[PDB]
Ligand binder design. Structure first.
Ligand SMILES: CO[C@@H]1O[C@H](CO)[C@H](O)[C@H](O[C@@H]2O[C@H](CO)[C@@H](O)[C@H](O)[C@H]2NC(C)=O)[C@H]1O
Lengths: 14, 133, 16, 133
């Protein structure tokens, strides 16, 4: 692990 | 169509869907992972027959869906999910069905599809996906 | 809150 | 283009963008929420100028985005987002840009857009969205 919090990411669009 | 909602799980081990090359997506069923055991989702069945089955067996956990894409459009005057393509970190499954109408796509940069819900009549009417880290 | 866990959901695609 | 990534915040207060009906979406800056206070995001600017600016000011926290959609198309050789529409629980903002090309959308049943990342050259090349509960 890292000390960096994660979050869902969707995309890209374009 | 009849509504279904599998809920949310730990992961996806296998997808079993069926489709027709002149129409749309028909049956849909998922074998999820739940805390390490395969969780056999209910088979969501089209009201009609005549479809081609496909089994998408993933090499879980190292293999996972990175993008779900497809087309929606008219079949017999219903808007339905006319095709689907599942792309993982290891390969692409599909397109299954008919690649016509309005495209849609959910690429994921971070996270996982952990559930499906939606609605099936003669064809898959619509669906949603549950996402989790 | 309730005691029911929550999940991000995206969609639906298809019929509106 | 120049890649940007705001990272993830608590919510979204305001969207500043710009467009040109001759071309596409040009600039993009978001005022986020960060724990019940405004956090002014970096302003991601096109390499060129000429666009009409738009401020979407949301009635935060009660108003939030439920769907983002758009169109991507070729502008003078660049494949770019030519149009955006933000649909909240309160109202629709847009379309801004030219509504021609391949459509895209992200509709959300449960969860919040809590950030954006993407690339902007002459125009908005593409973008992604952090999602959170
Ligand atoms: C059983 O015939 C029909 O099959 C189609 C396409 O699969 C569809 O699911 C029909 O259900 C109707 O779908 C409409 C969406 O296009 C929706 O507006 C209606 O409320 C649905 N009505 C019922 C009774 O399911 C399905 O009937």
């Amino acid at each position: 692990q890292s000390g960096i919090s994660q979050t869902v990411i969707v995309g890209p669009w374009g | 169509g009849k509504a279904f909602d599998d809920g949310a799980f730990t992961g996806i081990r296998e997808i079993n869907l069926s489709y027709n090359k002149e129409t749309a997506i028909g049956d849909f069923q998922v074998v999820y992972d739940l805390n390490g055991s395969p969780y056999v989702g209910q088979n969501h069945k089209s009201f009609i027959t005549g479809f081609t089955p496909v089994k998408i067996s993933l090499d879980f956990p190292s293999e996972y869906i990175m993008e779900v894409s497809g087309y929606t459009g008219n079949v017999s005057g219903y808007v339905v999910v006319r095709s689907l393509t599942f792309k993982t970190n290891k390969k692409t499954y599909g397109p299954y069905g008919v690649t016509s109408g309005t495209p849609f796509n959910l690429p994921i940069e971070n996270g996982l599809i952990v559930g499906f819900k939606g609605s099936i009549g003669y064809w898959l009417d619509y669906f949603s996906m549950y996402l989790s880290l």
